[PDB]
Design a binder for this molecule. Structure first.
Ligand SMILES: NC(=O)C1=CN([C@@H]2O[C@H](COP(=O)(O)OP(=O)(O)OC[C@H]3O[C@@H](n4cnc5c(N)ncnc54)[C@H](OP(=O)(O)O)[C@@H]3O)[C@@H](O)[C@H]2O)C=CC1
Ligand SMILES: NC(=O)C1=CN([C@@H]2O[C@H](COP(=O)(O)OP(=O)(O)OC[C@H]3O[C@@H](n4cnc5c(N)ncnc54)[C@H](OP(=O)(O)O)[C@@H]3O)[C@@H](O)[C@H]2O)C=CC1
Ligand SMILES: NC(=O)C1=CN([C@@H]2O[C@H](COP(=O)(O)OP(=O)(O)OC[C@H]3O[C@@H](n4cnc5c(N)ncnc54)[C@H](OP(=O)(O)O)[C@@H]3O)[C@@H](O)[C@H]2O)C=CC1
Ligand SMILES: NC(=O)C1=CN([C@@H]2O[C@H](COP(=O)(O)OP(=O)(O)OC[C@H]3O[C@@H](n4cnc5c(N)ncnc54)[C@H](OP(=O)(O)O)[C@@H]3O)[C@@H](O)[C@H]2O)C=CC1
Lengths: 337, 337, 337, 337
């Protein structure tokens, strides 16, 4: 019964909507979308998708102010300035912020000035903004938080299994590297950008760039403060990525024992969040997986009894979006005013 | 000898600079560049290129207002609004307009307001603007023209051999299709765009889109008005494109006679503009060619004695830029004021 | 009810299996497969596919001589020489020849020697072999034919609408060009090949190459003998292709009249074979379509009243395979011995 | 004055020839090539290259038994069976084995039965075959070795800087991962292969596969026996790769100190073998670098004083080939019988 609004109808915004549509007995009601591109555009791009394929639902425009999905009508507005949105007039409870532009209190707060009661950022928050990762620390959320963050795709892949390792072996220190698919922040052909590396043609290069997933894990898992670091390598694939972690543990072990620890959690406290694959698969095989992290068992190695190396896959668009849905579900169940 | 300013340091802007740098005894002198990205950005992207390779010349930043190439210094400015540019102050003779946004008389004229003397648009002009194609109708240029156009890359490939075909056999009617490399106007991943086809992931699809080259040919070749039309298909390659033309002629002929007609021109009036290749090559082999169009002789066909089909290659970035330098040299040699 | 054997478990071989599996009440029964790669390899590549996605059915290896799909068991054999195959022993009725090496009577006949009853080649036959295209001339099939051909993917896309155009307007002459996805006959990196163009890196170039579809059309449509010719351009996409046809007709017409003629057929005699699309889509949107050809109505053009240009899409892997299943059903319904 | 023969004219074979051609005062003389593809093919693919570009030399066929480069004539033969090659008759001193098929004594020995005096394998040798890496242990080579190995591209990138780290900090143990461009061993489209992962479409996936560079380093650097391991990830780029190493050292240090150690060696004992780059570059920027390893300084990290992480680039085709040339040069200088 929570009235939800989506601000920014891009890759995550559209993946969010399709993820929600597939749920059963949802406590959420999507009633409005702010797409600065218009009604025709919103309808066309929701129906046709180069990554997910054609949406199996009857999608069409409704007048010049809305669209409909299998009969359910959804209002569409268009304004680049949040302060002018009709949130108060419509009675919006929660705003899904997926523009990538209003990631700080100053910006996200504009939605509050317009009347919305709460805001959820689909990315790391800038400054003193509460950050949560489902399966790791969501129990710390309270109805008093007016603005929250669901972290990044990379942090949602790491956090889960890093927690299992620290509790069953004790992490002393480590480092990680992620081979990530390209995103809209990169350039199609060599062009201007703050990051001189992200300025180079994306379908043609291996592009190194910084990452904050390192210290982001420390936020959701206090024990790991100042114990990890890392970088990222952007490659020529449209979706699906992988993380490579190497850590030093206090408890001597062996590869076969580490995989056992993972399978146990995936079957209990992390069922639906973590998974373990024992087949020789490739990136494309992990498209549309609802979990946020999948361990590639055959690649697990242990050198010198204490140096562990782990490899895990993750659908950065779809898997992350299922998590945004879960967090929004928590906001609903904890609502009191 | 002629003061030249470059407005817009993108793909065409940077290619133009390198094309000019390699010329011997040039009547042009580039003294300033307007890069709304920064002195270092212009410096970095000029030295390193994903398509042309590393620039063979010592490139460096000369302070916070200029850069250095093989010693020479070139000022760098940043201002999205042309009316406020120091053109009149620097005594600029010609401005190379390559931003892709100021194509009409009002927009382009703003350079004249800033104090510039003449403007040359690296794209099709809108409205009442004289268009020229070297080798087709450049002889009709006059120093009196304050604003001119060099047409599109596709038009520069078509015009040259269409002219030969009309003079030798007489064109009645025809149609065209260009399989073109992707450009900056397209999107890396499904995203908002006025053209619902160009909005789709460029490195993943074959994308049909409109083209104006057909009607543009009639501009430089009046006898062809109303005789041609066509379309374009954008594909997953970063540079180099190909044209496929089918026309019905008044004089019966055959494949080898058509090829020979093209060779006579390439050896005479169109030397340096048109070429004929007899080897079995592919697109990558035509990168960095100086001509505007190259006929693939073994693909030429004639059906029913009067329906001719021709296939021609062209480097849309480097080939077109060499023609920009050529048209600029004509302006310099025609200065009588 | 009909014993079918699959010789060659490649792209076409595996697509055929999945196409058949989805049919309702099939008169065919696949009992054996000849994969010179192994029982597990056939098992692994059948379940996981980079183009079709994960097969939705429980696939498993049934020993060292067969596999299991949704319970059913299918024998697996390995023998590069057909003459030594247990066809006669298993009482095989029809053999689906999809290796691409046995296309003539001698080569294909070896299946008859092994004891097979009939053979159907998933490619153009060489010499004196009857060729059929569903929707064009399948009515001319007879149980007496021991060896038949289903033509190429391009021919199956062209024939259907060329037939409509000839009956309605009368074709005098024409030319064609197909922008086709790359296939297994090409090379990943520059390497030895009889065709010096197909020897070049496939994911990096636009590659011109010969095609036989033009002359092949005359086989199924005798009235077109000597009226068409054409070429092909291979581009960097893994599947889905498009045809561009230009013809001169005897009866004057216009674009919308041509489109309407195609719609009448799609709604009647060619339902399930030909379709007409009025939306602004791209290649990825046509993946997994069951028809042989789809007209892109907004691209149709007519120059000088009698020169018609048509653009049509086709899934070269999945679309063609559905036609293989259709021709196999005809053989089953025509069995009179 | 060493008479050399090249067996297998693929990517490495052709890169080898162009590398040699560019040297000054070479002690080698290439007189014959075994290309099972023929004279026309050998001439065409040497002249045109999708990665290196057009060879700046006059290349053509000479009769039907040879080719010429800038006037120098080179004989061409074609036979898949080494025992039948005219090595003894021609007086061949050294054979460059780049087929990827005769990597063991049994196979490579066939060249010795045919008359050649020595053989050099352009890949890791199988079994008890002497292995060398220029800049690390070439001083151990002696004229008595009849068959030798130059190791793999990955080992030539690692070995060099691993040596600098162990001598100035002391390596206790470590692990590595290499993000490598695809090669001819992979499949263009999902097809049969021993490695079920290498069987999947290469321009479309991130493909994990095993590597032997781990224990290969121990061969050229005894101190590191049983101290390292690792894996590989194949991505959608045509050439140029990168290595990521993480090791535990006995001497506490910091990132800035590690880079200093590298710059020192690159300027002395490893000049021409190792390099250090301090700019924000991308993969394409390292094409055609003659060194075998380039450290990306800005990416160097140190966690907990003793856990070091290093990132280095390498042109797997060209850089490796320059090393094959150097090793062959050593064979010449140490020749005595
Ligand atoms: N892709 C992924 O893997 C993940 C992305 N994210 C984060 O989500 C955010 C968006 O990323 P993503 O969906 O990937 O990218 P997209 O560019 O696909 O989506 C961003 C959208 O914001 C729209 N937009 C920008 N400003 C406005 C505005 N002021 N008003 C209305 N619409 C606006 C853009 O429209 P326009 O087309 O005009 O640019 C674009 O459609 C970023 O914060 C990103 O870091 C987080 C996790 C995963
Ligand atoms: N690429 C090709 O093959 C050809 C392109 N053209 C034409 O050339 C033009 C540009 O195309 P292209 O080089 O491909 O594109 P690019 O985006 O590479 O270059 C255009 C540049 O204009 C800059 N820019 C935009 N507005 C301004 C402004 N108002 N003031 C200063 N700088 C500005 C843009 O900066 P920013 O990035 O900040 O937006 C961008 O750098 C178009 O007219 C195009 O049709 C013609 C022939 C060939
Ligand atoms: N791909 C497409 O779009 C279409 C292809 N076709 C045609 O179908 C045929 C095959 O093409 P395609 O599926 O694309 O190619 P694939 O290589 O994917 O399939 C061909 C298969 O034949 C197997 N094979 C070869 N010889 C034998 C043999 N003697 N005995 C047993 N198995 C053998 C090959 O095995 P191995 O890998 O060991 O060499 C390979 O697996 C060709 O005639 C092609 O023109 C027709 C329509 C569409
Ligand atoms: N590419 C790289 O990065 C490196 C490769 N290597 C090694 O070098 C070897 C070749 O690799 P690469 O050049 O990359 O691959 P290629 O396939 O490009 O080269 C191998 C060549 O061997 C030819 N060939 C195979 N058998 C014979 C034969 N019996 N007689 C004559 N010619 C034959 C093949 O011809 P055909 O076309 O008929 O297949 C092919 O042209 C392998 O051992 C590989 O591991 C080592 C370092 C680097």
């Amino acid at each position: 019964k929570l009235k939800v609004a989506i601000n920014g109808f891009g890759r995550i915004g559209r993946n969010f909507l399709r993820c929600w549509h597939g749920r059963k007995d949802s406590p959420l009601d999507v009633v409005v979308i702010n797409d600065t591109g218009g009604v025709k555009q919103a309808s066309h791009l929701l129906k046709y998708d180069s990554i997910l394929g054609t949406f199996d639902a009857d999608v069409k425009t409704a007048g010049d102010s809305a669209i409909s999905v299998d009969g359910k009508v959804i209002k569409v507005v268009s304004d680049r300035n949040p302060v002018n949105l009709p949130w108060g007039d419509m009675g919006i409870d929660l705003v899904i912020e997926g523009t990538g532009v209003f990631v700080d209190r100053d910006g996200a707060g504009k939605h509050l000035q317009a009347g919305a009661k709460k805001v959820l950022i689909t990315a790391p928050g800038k400054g003193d903004i509460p950050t949560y990762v489902v399966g790791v620390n969501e129990e710390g959320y309270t109805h008093a938080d007016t603005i929250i963050s669901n972290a990044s795709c990379t942090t949602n892949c790491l956090a889960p299994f890093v927690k299992v390792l620290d509790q069953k072996f004790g992490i002393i220190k480590g480092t990680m590297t992620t081979t990530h698919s390209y995103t809209g922040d990169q350039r199609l052909l060599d062009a201007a950008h703050r990051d001189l590396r992200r300025a180079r043609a994306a379908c043609l290069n291996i592009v190194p760039t910084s990452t904050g997933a390192a210290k982001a894990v420390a936020l959701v898992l206090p024990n790991l403060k100042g114990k990890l670091n890392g970088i990222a390598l952007r490659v020529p694939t449209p979706n699906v990525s992988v993380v490579d972690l190497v850590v030093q543990v206090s408890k001597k072990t062996f590869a076969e024992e580490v995989n056992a620890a993972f399978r146990e959690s995936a079957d209990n406290e992390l069922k639906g969040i973590l998974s373990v694959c024992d087949e020789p698969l490739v990136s494309i095989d992990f498209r549309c997986t609802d979990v946020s992290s999948t361990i590639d068992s055959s690649l697990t190695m242990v050198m010198g009894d204490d140096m562990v190396k782990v490899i895990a896959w993750y659908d950065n668009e779809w898997g992350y979006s299922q998590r945004v849905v879960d967090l929004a579900d928590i906001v609903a169940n904890k609502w009191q005013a």
